[PDB]
Symmetry: D2
Subunit: 42 residues, 4 copies
């Protein structure tokens, strides 16, 4: 498929695997919002 | 000092510089509470 | 439509107007994923 | 003691008890850093 070039691309070292999964959820959250930006104004 | 056994160490790609600073903030947030887990709750 | 059984309904006092808008953003974030829990993951 | 001028005070309806405990955790997180804003960064 090859996705287009999105915004920049940084990284973050999250210590502790427990809190790691927690941050991952927040990442996907904002990710879906960005995809809803190109969606209808509704 | 600091911590004997360090937890795992993963990483996360944060697209977008604006949202990046947002996640980094939460990172130090949880890290602070971790240092408070040393002395019992008071 | 929307959702048959609504989950519980609590509340939270957010001190500071600046940080307030920050939490509200995460609120709608999780709410969006909840609506996606209807159709299987794809 | 504590803080002279308290910031504003709003509220937020968190649907779902599971996600509720999640937001509450981040609440105390930012509150802790606020108390550290007293002494310069070190």
């Amino acid at each position: 498929k090859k996705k287009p070039l999105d915004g920049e691309y940084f990284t973050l070292q999250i210590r502790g695997r427990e809190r790691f999964e927690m941050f991952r959820e927040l990442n996907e959250a904002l990710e879906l919002k960005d995809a809803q930006a190109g969606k209808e104004p509704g």
